[PDB]
């Protein structure tokens, strides 16, 4: 089982990494959406100014 | 993404701060104008009286 333990250690990192990569992508997607909302707001506010 | 969001947010805040200042100045103009408007209405009634 010593070998299997090492493999499962990698599998935890992999599943965690996939979750982290997915969460990072989701966060980046939200950030771009917010930057877009802020940019749209900025344009309207610049016109408002 | 965070840096760009921070920059866009900073620009929005700066533009909003100017908007609030302009809104306060616009309110003050309405107040002063109201004083001149009262006078204008008073003078029109006074002129017609004279």
Q: Is A24 on the interface with B (CB under 8 A)?
A: no
Q: How far from A45 is each of A15, A31, A40, B20, CA to CA, in Å?
A: 44, 20, 9, 11
Helix and strand element counts for chain A (H, E): 1, 0
Residue whose tokens read 């877009």: A36
Rounded distance, CA B16 to CA B28, Å? 18
Rounded distance, CA B11 to CA A28, Å? 20
Rounded distance, CA A43 to CA B15, Å? 10
Q: How far from A1 is each of A5, A9, A16, CA to CA, in Å?
A: 6, 12, 22
Asked if A42 and B8 count as a contact pair (C-beta separation under 8 A), the reply is yes
CA-based nearest distance A17→chain B, Å: 20
Quick one: residue B38, left, alpha or beta (phi over 0 = left, psi -120 to 50 = alpha)?
alpha
Rounded distance, CA A40 to CA B8, Å? 10
Q: Is A19 on the interface with B (CB under 8 A)?
A: no
Provide, as residue numbers in chain B, all residues whose Cβ is less than 8 Å from the Cβ of A27: 1
């Amino acid at each position: 089982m010593e070998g299997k333990w090492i493999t499962d250690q990698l599998r935890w990192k992999i599943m965690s990494c996939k979750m982290r990569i997915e969460q990072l992508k989701q966060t980046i997607c939200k950030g771009n959406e917010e930057m877009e909302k802020n940019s749209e707001g900025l344009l309207k506010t610049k016109e408002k100014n | 993404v965070e840096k760009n969001r921070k920059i866009v947010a900073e620009n929005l805040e700066k533009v909003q701060a100017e908007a609030e200042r302009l809104d306060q100045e616009e309110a003050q103009y309405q107040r002063e104008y109201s004083e001149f408007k009262r006078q204008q209405l008073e003078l029109d009634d006074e002129l017609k009286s004279v």
